[PDB]
């Protein structure tokens, strides 16, 4: 048997472990990089494997999201029967998120970016302001 | 609106607090996750990634509610890709038959041994592969 079967199987395996060690080395760096921003080795593999699962899921999801845009709104309209008071507040926002949309993409994303550090710093005083806003929403 | 509904709302106020702190707990879990397996600048971004994972996770859980139909619907469209996979699902079903408890047995032993085996595995692969190849050389 061996000459055909071995030749075909070894060629396929050879590529696969080369890609797998490439995939591992992609992940090895990636995983480091994320933590770098800041049973353990079995966890380091398992964490990566979980990351590969997230990547797998994200590939499927990324494809699914592309392919609807290429059904979400209609499923969101079933949720709109539950949501409808909060969805009436979303209807004006969907007038800004379409309306100002091109302008807001450039302008707002930069303005808010340094506002992102401002949000982190403001968040703690904003929690009492959000409680005040909630008391106003209960009042009127 | 009754005082008993207010006592339930107060448990909801610990749910608010529990939600905020739940974000930070995820980070804490991860921190040993890495260490087993200025700081705003990194910490902040890392909690955003947690947010994205939480959202994603919720979307995945919601897809499981749509399912438990969705699985079959996609799995049918995937047949458009399946060459081997049609034959391979039954093969995985050979272990599938070793089902209710015995899947869990397989998983549990695979973890429990698995680290030791994974060290052993490159040492073991030469003799292991040699043995199967010898059974084909026979």
From Swiss-Prot, chain A:
Family: Belongs to the orthohepadnavirus major surface antigen family.
Organism domain of life: Viruses
Signal peptide, first to last residue: none
GO BP term, example: fusion of virus membrane with host endosome membrane
Function, in words: The large envelope protein exists in two topological conformations, one which is termed 'external' or Le-HBsAg and the other 'internal' or Li-HBsAg. In its external conformation the protein attaches the virus to cell receptors and thereby initiating infection. This interaction determines the species specificity and liver tropism. This attachment induces virion internalization predominantly through caveolin-mediated endocytosis. The large envelope protein also assures fusion between virion membrane and endosomal membrane. The middle envelope protein plays an important role in the budding of the virion. It is involved in the induction of budding in a nucleocapsid independent way. In this process the majority of envelope proteins bud to form subviral lipoprotein particles of 22 nm of diameter that do not contain a nucleocapsid.
Maturation and modification: Isoform M is N-terminally acetylated by host at a ratio of 90%, and N-glycosylated by host at the pre-S2 region. Myristoylated.
UniProt topological domain (Intravirion) ranges: 110-115
Domain description: The large envelope protein is synthesized with the pre-S region at the cytosolic side of the endoplasmic reticulum and, hence will be within the virion after budding. Therefore the pre-S region is not N-glycosylated. Later a post-translational translocation of N-terminal pre-S and TM1 domains occur in about 50% of proteins at the virion surface. These molecules change their topology by an unknown mechanism, resulting in exposure of pre-S region at virion surface.
Name of the featured protein: Large envelope protein
Whole-protein coverage range: 210 to 431 of 431
Segments crossing the lipid bilayer: 6-26, 49-69, 89-109, 116-138
Organism expressing this protein natively: Woodchuck hepatitis B virus (isolate 8)
Protein localization: Virion membrane
All ranges on the Virion surface side of the membrane: 139-140
Keywords, comma-separated and alphabetical: Acetylation, Caveolin-mediated endocytosis of virus by host, Fusion of virus membrane with host endosomal membrane, Fusion of virus membrane with host membrane, Glycoprotein, Host-virus interaction, Lipoprotein, Membrane, Myristate, Transmembrane, Transmembrane helix, Viral attachment to host cell, Viral envelope protein, Viral penetration into host cytoplasm, Virion, Virus endocytosis by host, Virus entry into host cell
Primary residence: virion
Gene: S
A single GO cellular-component term on record: membrane
Curated annotation (Swiss-Prot), chain B:
PTM comment text: Isoform M is N-terminally acetylated by host at a ratio of 90%, and N-glycosylated by host at the pre-S2 region.
Residues spanning the membrane: 6-26, 48-68, 87-107, 114-136
Entry's localization field: Virion membrane
Intravirion membrane side: 108-113
Virion surface face of the membrane: 137-138
Function per UniProt: The large envelope protein exists in two topological conformations, one which is termed 'external' or Le-HBsAg and the other 'internal' or Li-HBsAg. In its external conformation the protein attaches the virus to cell receptors and thereby initiating infection. This interaction determines the species specificity and liver tropism. This attachment induces virion internalization predominantly through caveolin-mediated endocytosis. The large envelope protein also assures fusion between virion membrane and endosomal membrane.
Membership in a protein family: Belongs to the orthohepadnavirus major surface antigen family.
Domains as described in the record: The large envelope protein is synthesized with the pre-S region at the cytosolic side of the endoplasmic reticulum and, hence will be within the virion after budding. Therefore the pre-S region is not N-glycosylated. Later a post-translational translocation of N-terminal pre-S and TM1 domains occur in about 50% of proteins at the virion surface. These molecules change their topology by an unknown mechanism, resulting in exposure of pre-S region at virion surface.
Name of this chain's protein: Large envelope protein
Organism: Woodchuck hepatitis B virus (isolate 8)
Gene designation per UniProt: S
Span of the entire protein shown here: 210 to 431 of 431
């Amino acid at each position: 048997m061996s000459p055909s079967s071995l030749l075909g199987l070894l060629a396929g395996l050879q590529v696969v472990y080369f890609l797998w060690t490439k995939i591992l080395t992609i992940a090895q760096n990636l995983d480091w990089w994320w933590t770098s921003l800041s049973n353990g080795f079995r966890w380091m593999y398992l964490r990566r494997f979980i990351i590969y699962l997230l990547v797998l899921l994200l590939c499927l999801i990324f494809l699914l999201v592309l392919l609807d845009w290429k059904a979400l709104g209609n499923y969101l309209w079933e949720w709109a029967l539950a949501r409808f008071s909060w969805l009436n507040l979303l209807v004006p926002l969907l007038q800004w998120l379409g309306g100002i949309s091109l302008i807001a993409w450039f302008l707002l994303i930069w303005m808010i970016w340094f506002w992102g550090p401002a949000l982190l710093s403001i968040l703690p005083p904003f929690i009492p302001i959000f409680v005040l806003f909630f008391l106003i929403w209960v009042y009127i």
